[PDB]
Design a protein around this ligand. Structure first.
Ligand SMILES: CCCCCCCC/C=C\CCCCCCCC(=O)O
Ligand SMILES: CCCCCCCC/C=C\CCCCCCCC(=O)O
Length: 126
């Protein structure tokens, strides 16, 4: 069950991922420690998100099994389709990054794997 407004608790490889993809140290030092809200509304295939990237609210919707355009940090807007296992594990192919989102009861983890860099968020359902 994915529906909820999930507040951020722990954020792992933020400094190593944002410098590896080409972002500024001034904006990285602002968004690294802010405990913001990460929303998801589960409508069968269409998952409507409202995500806090430090100060910016990035709101887009992903379709499980058909093409869906989402905003990236380095780039523009990526058509990344998401596959679902057991109503808790969401897997996609972003801008050369394997993104794995897992729901453990009422706590969600977003693990963005870029080769050796493992960018892991840990947010609780509210
Ligand atoms: C889907 C969950 C993962 C979301 C990851 C978002 C990563 C954002 C990374 C870097 C951008 C940080 C921007 C910080 C605010 C800058 C503007 C300001 O307040 O001055
Ligand atoms: C590089 C980050 C750009 C911002 C959008 C990233 C979207 C990734 C795609 C699909 C997974 C969406 C997961 C939504 C829940 C995030 C929970 C969290 O913030 O802790």
């Amino acid at each position: 069950s994915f529906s909820g407004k999930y507040q951020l608790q722990s954020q792992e490889n933020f400094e190593a991922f944002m410098k590896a993809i080409g972002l500024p140290e001034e904006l990285i030092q602002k968004g690294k420690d802010i405990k913001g809200v990460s929303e998801i509304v589960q409508n069968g295939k269409h998952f409507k998100f409202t995500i806090t990237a430090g100060s910016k609210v990035i709101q887009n919707e992903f379709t499980v099994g058909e093409e869906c355009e989402l905003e990236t940090m380095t780039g523009e807007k990526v058509k990344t389709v998401v596959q679902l296992e057991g109503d808790n594990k969401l897997v996609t192919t972003f801008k050369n990054i394997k993104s794995v989102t897992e729901l453990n009861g009422d706590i969600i983890t977003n693990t963005m794997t870029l080769g050796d860099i493992v960018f892991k968020r840990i947010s609780k359902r509210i």
